[PDB]
Write a protein that binds this ligand. Structure first.
Ligand SMILES: CSc1ccc(Br)cc1CC(=O)N1CCC[C@H](C(N)=O)CC1
Ligand SMILES: [Zn+2]
Length: 139
């Protein structure tokens, strides 16, 4: 689990969005596994606007942060799950690092701010949904 709180927005994995997220929907994209809902309180986070390919992510299944080198956002095949049919997930960055299903929502940060959230993984990989291109989160 986990979310990004920026301005009056809450960014979550679309597959973990709550009834309240859907009732306050701003934007969602199944191909990216992202959903953004509106909030009444001002958020605590800021978003990176950069091309970093290294950073640190929070891994809830280890209660620890780990450093990673990750690929640039791209279209990657993701096998069927209980949440989605077999499809290509867009804006996805892969890295070598531990992850388990419940680790979705962990934040990836570089020195500039939040880069994205855990969205896929397994067998020693961890995949992050990028949010750096969503410029409207800042206004
Ligand atoms: C951190 S995810 C993970 C980690 C380890 C293992 Br084994 C397996 C997973 C994958 C997983 O649980 N899902 C369910 C959530 C949907 C997601 C998606 N973005 O389409 C991909 C599939
Ligand atoms: Zn950066």
């Amino acid at each position: 689990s986990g979310a990004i709180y920026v301005g009056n927005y809450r960014v979550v994995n679309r597959h973990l969005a709550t009834h309240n997220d859907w009732a306050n929907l701003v934007w969602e994209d199944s191909s990216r596994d992202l959903l953004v809902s509106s909030t009444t309180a001002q958020g605590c986070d800021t978003i990176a606007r950069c091309d970093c390919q290294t950073g640190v992510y929070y891994c809830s299944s280890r209660r620890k942060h780990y450093p990673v080198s990750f690929s640039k956002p791209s279209l990657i095949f993701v096998e069927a799950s209980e949440y989605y049919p077999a499809r290509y997930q867009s804006h996805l960055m892969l890295a070598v690092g531990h992850s388990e299903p419940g680790d979705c929502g962990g934040i990836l940060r570089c020195q500039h701010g939040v880069v994205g959230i855990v969205s896929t993984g397994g067998n020693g990989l961890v995949g992050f949904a990028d949010v750096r291109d969503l410029l409207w989160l800042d206004e």
